[PDB]
Amino acid sequence: AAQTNAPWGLARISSTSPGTSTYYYDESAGQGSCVYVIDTGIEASHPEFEGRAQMVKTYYYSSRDGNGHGTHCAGTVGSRTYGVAKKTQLFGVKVLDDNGSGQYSTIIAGMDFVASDKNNRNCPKGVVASLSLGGGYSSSVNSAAARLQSSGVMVAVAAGNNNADARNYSPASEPSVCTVGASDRYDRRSSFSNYGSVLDIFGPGTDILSTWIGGSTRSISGTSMATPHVAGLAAYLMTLGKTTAASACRYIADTANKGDLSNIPFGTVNLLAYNNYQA
Ligand SMILES: [Ca+2]
Ligand SMILES: [Ca+2]
Numbered sequence: 220a221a222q223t224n225a226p227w228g229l230a231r232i233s234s235t236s237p238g239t240s241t242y243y244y245d246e247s248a249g250q251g252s253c254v255y256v257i258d259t260g261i262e263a264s265h266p267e268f269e270g271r272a273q274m275v276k277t278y279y280y281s282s283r284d285g286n287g288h289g290t291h292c293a294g295t296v297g298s299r300t301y302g303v304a305k306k307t308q309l310f311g312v313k314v315l316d317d318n319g320s321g322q323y324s325t326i327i328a329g330m331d332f333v334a335s336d337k338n339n340r341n342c343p344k345g346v347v348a349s350l351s352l353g354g355g356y357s358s359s360v361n362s363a364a365a366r367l368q369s370s371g372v373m374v375a376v377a378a379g380n381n382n383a384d385a386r387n388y389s390p391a392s393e394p395s396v397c398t399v400g401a402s403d404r405y406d407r408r409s410s411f412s413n414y415g416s417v418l419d420i421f422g423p424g425t426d427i428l429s430t431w432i433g434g435s436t437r438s439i440s441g442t443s444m445a446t447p448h449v450a451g452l453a454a455y456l457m458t459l460g461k462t463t464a465a466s467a468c469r470y471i472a473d474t475a476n477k478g479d480l481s482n483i484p485f486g487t488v489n490l491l492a493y494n495n496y497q498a
Contacts, residue, residue: 228423249304252454253342258289261311267298277313285317294430295447303451334370349450351443361393373464384415397468401445422448
C-alpha cells in the first residue's frame with residue numbers, strides 16, 4: 220500500500236533518502252498488535268481513530284485528554300491519516316494531567332498497570348508501550364521501565380529535549396528499553412534532541428503533523444514526537460512476524476538507515492528508523 224502526500228515523517232521511515240512524500244507500507248498495518256500510549260490521555264472519539272482507541276486507566280479526575288499531547292502521539296502510532304500502524308489497537312493511560320505534568324509515583328504506577336493489564340487484552344501479535352515523557356534521573360522510574368520491558372512489552376521512550384546527554388534523564392537512561400532521538404526533514408539531528416551512548420535509534424521529531432483534541436490536527440516538535448514513530452514501527456513489524464517485543468529495538472537498529480544523519484556527536488548512534496518495505 221502507499222499513502223500519497225503523507226506527513227514527511229511517515230514518508231521518511233519508508234525511504235532510504237529524505238525528500239519523499241509517499242508512505243509505503245504493508246497492508247497488515249499492525250492489525251492484531253496493541254499499543255499503550257502513556258501520556259495525557261486520548262480523545263478516543265476522534266474520527267481518525269476509527270473506533271480503534273480507548274481509555275483504559277486514568278490517575279486524575281477524568282479520562283479526557285484536556286491537553287492534546289496524548290492524542291497527538293497516539294495519532295502518530297495508529298491514526299488513519301497520520302499513523303505508522305494504521306490498524307493497531309490503541310489503549311490510553313492518563314498519567315499526566317492536562318497541563319502535561321505528573322508525579323514520578325504516578326508514572327511508575329502507570330507502567331506497572333500496563334504490565335498487568337495486557338494480560339486481560341486480546342493482542343495476539345504483541346504489545347508495545349509509547350512513553351513520550353521524561354524528567355531528571357530517577358533509579359525508581361528506570362526500574363519501572365525495565366520491569367515493563369521484562370514483562371513482555373516493547374517499551375519505547377523519548378530521549379528528552381535538552382540538547383544534552385540522555386544519561387541524566389529518566390526513563391531515557393534505562394538501557395533495557397528503546398531510547399529514541401529526534402531528526403528533522405533534512406536528516407539533521409533536531410536541535411533540541413538529547414544524545415549519548417544510551418540512545419538506540421532516531422525517528423522523525425521536528426514539525427510532526429498529527430491528531431489534536433477537539434477533532435482537530437496540529438504540528439509540533441520534540442523527541443516526544445519521535446517516540447511514537449518507533450512504537451508504531453515496532454507494532455507494525457511484530458504483526459509482520461519479523462521480530463518480538465524482547466528484540467524489536469535491536470531489530471529496528473539492525474535494519475535502520477545507517478549514516479544518513481548530520482550533527483550526530485561522536486559516540487551517538489547514526490541510525491534512522493526504516494521499515495524496509497518492498498512491494
Ligand atoms: Ca540513505
Ligand atoms: Ca536501549
